[PDB]
């Protein structure tokens, strides 16, 4: 595949070339630097379980095919979030009201709904069939009728390195996913929009924060703090095998 | 590097050439006199953990590179505090009000804020890239476009010794850091300014002290006394391996 790296390197980010930037840390055995965006992040070992790739079973190098399937899933989920962020910023910040009420103001019912759903699913099923059918011969799955989709050959055309685009794409998509999670959770606690929250925070950043919106802003903090205290205990327990 | 010493010596200060000036004290194994400002101060052994230097991994002398990275961090943090102390004394003691309200009286909002932030970050990212890129070939990181930055060669031009400037710089920076911590905590308990506290203490030094400002002056003393009683018990426990 061309979705895998060519140099097997770890980039030096905020603290080190690994999350958890202390000296008592050994990266997980199945993460060795072969895929873009590697940092050894796996507190719950979901890379050795959690999925079944569409490959012939009992073929050697099957445990690696599962990480490639999960990477395909990660890229696919990020490529939609990067489009959704642009599509919500270019609408909510141009003329329109809350972005979470636009679909409910189309008045789609009866026959048009049915024909739209059926046609969209026909197209997506035809594309998905080809994706599944591509992954199985070559360990890669391009979305638009081709296994690789490089209409303009730019996968190695960046003047700062060979495998630079591959590392940039998996990181922009990774940032956009939790960007959109932020939009979805912000719209439910504050009631305002994205820009209307940034400006409120920049105006006076000591009452226009999360801790001043009532019970929801406390419930989210509680959930976040409880989930963040479990994946660190899990990592500490993992380091003792 | 030229940030390390040439003579491997310990200077004799307030009590001895070590903190904890008693006879039952052996310096930590990783602190041996090779860096400026050495005193064997390490109750919590943060010099063998806590960080990952940007060097090629598995290269010999990796445990020493981490102390050099932490020394780089110490010098970097001190060089900003020494500028901030001068910048707050030359403003608060010249004409202006509380120094912790100046940024809030610039009225920076909208486009100017965004362009200023983006430009500053562009410049700092360009400089930081060069710093990270310098540390990795030579174990040193100068901030201003050069690995060493000696426009006027004065690193060995002091008429009291060879490595005198190196020991003076790490100590002035070390004093300025807790100087500024004092300014920040003083402004929150007293409400006055820096000079307005020194003059109040010199006027009548038995009611213009920390113990007479209410509950905050007691909370700070309590926190200080609780943190000071933990790093001595830790040192005593360390001395018994
Ligand atoms: C409350 C829980 C919690 C906390 C406190 C942290 C804290 C941290 N995480 Mg995170 N993390 C958490 C939950 C949490 N994590 C969860 C739930 C997940 C699952 C998704 C992760 C997954 C995760 C990963 C995968 C990584 C981290 C990393 C980090 C570090 C960088 C954070 C960062 O970029 O800040 C944002 C900060 C900035 C963009 C710049 C900071 C500058 C600000 C604006 C002010 C100046 C800086 C500051 C003053 C300097 C120190 C001063 C201070 C000591 C007084 C940091 C120690 C990274 C790390 O440690 O890499 C080595 C990392 O790779 N975390
Ligand atoms: C759905 C998106 C998705 C998927 C499929 C993956 C998949 C992968 N990531 Mg992860 N990752 C993602 C999003 C995703 N990532 C995001 C958004 C971040 C930013 C925090 C990261 C950051 C990250 C790092 C730093 C690293 C990986 C790595 C990996 C690989 C490790 C194996 C693994 O855990 O796979 C299984 C993963 C799943 C099956 C997804 C499980 C989703 C859970 C169950 C839902 C949790 C939802 C909850 C609301 C989260 C709240 C977070 C918020 C509070 C902060 C794998 C290819 C490692 C690697 O080597 O990559 C090449 C690696 O070093 N990822
Ligand atoms: C917090 C939000 C969130 C999170 C955490 C995820 C996480 C995930 N999505 Mg995504 N997704 C989201 C929002 C989110 N999604 C939204 C808003 C949309 C709208 C378009 C989608 C639509 C979507 C689709 C259509 C699909 C995913 C899939 C996935 C999974 C892909 C990883 C993989 O291949 O492992 C595969 C892991 C398994 C097969 C283990 C199954 C265990 C179950 C599912 C536990 C739950 C991953 C768990 C893919 C998937 O396979 O989901 C299961 C998938 O088909 N997502
Ligand atoms: C997947 C994300 C997503 C989703 C679900 C929607 C959904 C919607 N958008 Mg769209 N939109 C998106 C992304 C998205 N948008 C993007 C990326 C942009 C920036 C160009 C916009 C800009 C935009 C505007 C300006 C408006 C909408 C509006 C709408 C609504 C009516 C449909 C319409 O007029 O579309 C029009 C959308 C477009 C002309 C751009 C579509 C871009 C597609 C989805 C990106 C993917 C293209 C694909 C990969 C190309 C394949 C090429 C290959 C075969 C070679 C609808 C709820 C209208 C609205 O808000 O009504 C109230 C409206 O005025 N959108
Ligand atoms: C993706 C990045 C992102 C950004 C830039 C912001 C920005 C903001 N959020 Mg947060 N937010 C995010 C994700 C993000 N959010 C996520 C993932 C969640 C779900 C847990 C929320 C849920 C949330 C709520 C419920 C509220 C905010 C609010 C705010 C504002 C005040 C800060 C605060 O209270 O943070 C709180 C942050 C958290 C609870 C969790 C940390 C969020 C991520 C993981 C930190 C990422 C750090 C990273 C270095 C930032 C990059 C910035 C980017 C420009 C490069 C501010 C505009 C408040 C607001 O609107 O005030 C007006 C508010 O009420 N956010
Ligand atoms: C409440 C807790 C506490 C106390 C009582 C002390 C006490 C001491 N520390 Mg400190 N220390 C503490 C917490 C504390 N430390 C903490 C939290 C840290 C972490 C940052 C350290 C880290 C630390 C280090 C790294 C070092 C010390 C050192 C010292 C000694 C010198 C202090 C000094 O310069 O005073 C200031 C005094 C003067 C500048 C001059 C004194 C003159 C005054 C004005 C009056 C006259 C002197 C006096 C009357 C003479 C004795 C008389 C008396 C017996 C009646 C002293 C025994 C040093 C040491 O022992 O070196 C051998 C040393 O190197 N400490
Ligand atoms: C951020 C600044 C900073 C940093 C990075 C370092 C780094 C270092 N110092 Mg330390 N040092 C500092 C400030 C700093 N120092 C200050 C301000 C003082 C004066 C009290 C000293 C005094 C001192 C001595 C006397 C010695 C060192 C030495 C060392 C080395 C020991 C290894 C170590 O612990 O590193 C790791 C350190 C860190 C990761 C910083 C941790 C910061 C903690 C977690 C925060 C505590 C904040 C809290 C509010 C403090 C309140 C104090 C107040 C109540 C008095 C290392 C290079 C030894 C050496 O050989 O130097 C060459 C040595 O002998 N330092
Ligand atoms: C009490 C105040 C205080 C203290 C104790 C520290 C302490 C520290 N600062 Mg500094 N800093 C301060 C105020 C303070 N800062 C202020 C006011 C500013 C404004 C400019 C900054 C901005 C600043 C930046 C931008 C950075 C630091 C960094 C650091 C760390 C450098 C040591 C190192 O390289 O180890 C490295 C140690 C680790 C990677 C271990 C991570 C463990 C986490 C961070 C525990 C917390 C050190 C812990 C640097 C750093 O790396 O921070 C983590 C860093 O990038 N500081
Ligand atoms: C890092 C510390 C720091 C910070 C954050 C600030 C911040 C500020 N200062 Mg400045 N200031 C500083 C240090 C600092 N100062 C120093 C060191 C001095 C002594 C010369 C002053 C003296 C000073 C005065 C007299 C005034 C301010 C004022 C201000 C405010 C408006 C900006 C301005 O007019 O700057 C003007 C600042 C300068 C002309 C001096 C800047 C010195 C820089 C920061 C030192 C570093 C230089 C750099 C290393 C050189 C690189 C060379 C290399 C390429 C070869 C602003 C909040 C104004 C104010 O209070 O308005 C209400 C104001 O009147 N400052
Ligand atoms: C927890 C854990 C354990 C470890 O072992 C490893 C690990 C990495 C798994 C780790 C963490 C995993 C994490 C944090 C994963 C997070 C995944 C996340 C947050 C994924 C988010 C995906 C979001 C997506 C697709 C969003 C799609 C949004 C769309 C929106 C569509 C819109 C709608 C509805 C109408 C609007 O008018 C217009 C528009 C906004 C476009 C649709 O266009």
B41 lines ligand 7 (CB under 6 A): yes
Q: Which residues contact A183 (CB under 8 A, 6 or more apart)?
A: A85, A88, A99, A194
Closest C-alpha among A50, A77, A64, A59 to residue A1: A64
- The alpha carbon of A175 and the centre of ligand 2 are apart by a number of angstroms equal to 11
Query: If residue B13 lies in a helix (H) or strand (E), which one and from where to where?
Result: none
Residue A222 phi/psi, 5-degree rounding, is -60, -45
DSSP for A86-154 reads HHHHHHHTTT-S-TTSSGGGS---SHHHHHHHHHHHHHHHHHHHHHHHHHTTSS---SSSSSS--SS--
Tell if the CB–CB gap between B52 and A16 is shorter than 8 Å: yes
- Determine contact, residues B135/B55, Cβ cutoff 8 Å: yes
Buried b (16+ CB within 10 A) or exposed e, A11-29: eeeeebbbbbeeeeeebee
- The alpha carbon of B47 and the centre of ligand 1 are apart by a number of angstroms equal to 21
Beta bridge partners of B159: B161
Beta bridge partners of B161: B158, B159
Count CB-CB contacts under 10 A for residue B229.
10
Using CB atoms, pick whichever of B48, B52, B66 lies closest to residue A15.
B52
Residues written for chain B: 241
Q: Which residues contact A136 (CB under 8 A, 6 or more apart)?
A: A54, A55, A56
* A1 CB-side CA count, 13 A: 24
Tell if the CB–CB gap between A21 and B113 is shorter than 8 Å: no
Count CB-CB contacts under 10 A for residue B194.
19
- Longest Cα–Cα distance in chain A: 63
Token readout for A3 is 């979705």
Q: What is the CA radius of gyration of chain B?
A: 22
- Determine contact, residues B177/B81, Cβ cutoff 8 Å: yes
Q: Which ligand is nearest to the CA of B229?
A: 6
The Cα A177–Cα A78 span in angstroms is 6
What does each C-alpha distance from A42 to A13, A45, A46, A77, A233 come to in angstroms?
A: 17, 6, 7, 19, 12
- Determine contact, residues A45/A238, Cβ cutoff 8 Å: yes
The Cα A191–Cα A193 span in angstroms is 7
B52 touches chain A (CB under 8 A): yes
The Cα B222–Cα B216 span in angstroms is 10
| Ordered alpha helix ranges (H), chain A | 63-92, 111-135, 165-189, 194-203, 216-228, 230-239
Long-range contacts of A165-170 (CB under 8 A, 24+ apart): A166/A3, A166/A5, A166/A36, A167/A11, A167/A36, A167/A37, A169/A36, A169/A75, A169/A78, A170/A36, A170/A37, A170/A71, A170/A74, A170/A75, A170/A78
Token readout for B107 is 């009225």
Tell if the CB–CB gap between B50 and A23 is shorter than 8 Å: yes
Candidates A13, A15, A20: which one to mutate for ligand 8, based on the most atoms within 8 Å of Cβ?
A15
- Determine contact, residues A47/A39, Cβ cutoff 8 Å: no
- Longest Cα–Cα distance in chain B: 63
| Ordered alpha helix ranges (H), B60-164 | 63-92, 111-135
- Determine contact, residues A216/A188, Cβ cutoff 8 Å: yes
**Minimal Cα–Cα distance from A20 to chain B, Å?**
9
Closest C-alpha among B112, B145, B139 to residue B127: B145
Mutate to test the interface with B, among A16, A208, A236 (most CBs of B within 10 A): A16
B66 touches chain A (CB under 8 A): yes
**Under DSSP, is residue A223 helix (H, G, I), strand (E, B) or coil?**
helix
Closest C-alpha among B1, B19, B7, B22 to residue B174: B19
Q: What is the dihedral of CA B163, B166, B172, B177, to 10 degrees?
A: -150
Count CB-CB contacts under 10 A for residue B18.
18
């Amino acid at each position: 595949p061309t979705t895998m790296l060519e140099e097997r390197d770890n980039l030096w980010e905020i603290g080190g070339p690994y999350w958890w930037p202390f000296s008592s840390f050994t990266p997980p055995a199945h993460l060795d630097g072969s895929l873009p965006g590697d940092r050894g992040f796996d507190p719950f070992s979901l890379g050795t379980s959690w999925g079944q790739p569409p490959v012939d079973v009992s073929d050697p190098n099957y445990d690696e095919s599962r990480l490639r399937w999960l990477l395909e899933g990660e890229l696919y989920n990020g490529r939609l979030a990067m489009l959704a962020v642009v599509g919500v910023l270019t609408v909510e910040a141009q003329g329109k009201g809350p972005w979470w009420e636009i679909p409910g103001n189309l008045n789609l019912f009866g026959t048009p709904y049915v024909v739209a759903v059926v046609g969209g699913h026909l197209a997506f099923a035809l594309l998905e069939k080809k994706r599944l059918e591509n992954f199985r011969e070559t360990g890669e799955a391009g979305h638009f009728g081709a296994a690789r989709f490089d209409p303009l050959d730019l996968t190695e055309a960046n003047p700062l390195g060979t495998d630079y685009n591959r590392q940039a794409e998996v990181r922009n998509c990774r940032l956009a996913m939790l960007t959109f999670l932020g939009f979805s959770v912000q719209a439910w606690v504050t009631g305002k929009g994205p820009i209307e929250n940034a400006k409120d925070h920049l105006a006076s950043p000591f009452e226009a924060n999360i801790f001043t919106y009532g019970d929801r802003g406390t419930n989210v903090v509680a959930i976040f703090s409880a989930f963040a205290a479990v994946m660190h205990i899990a990592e500490l327990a993992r380091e003792k095998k």
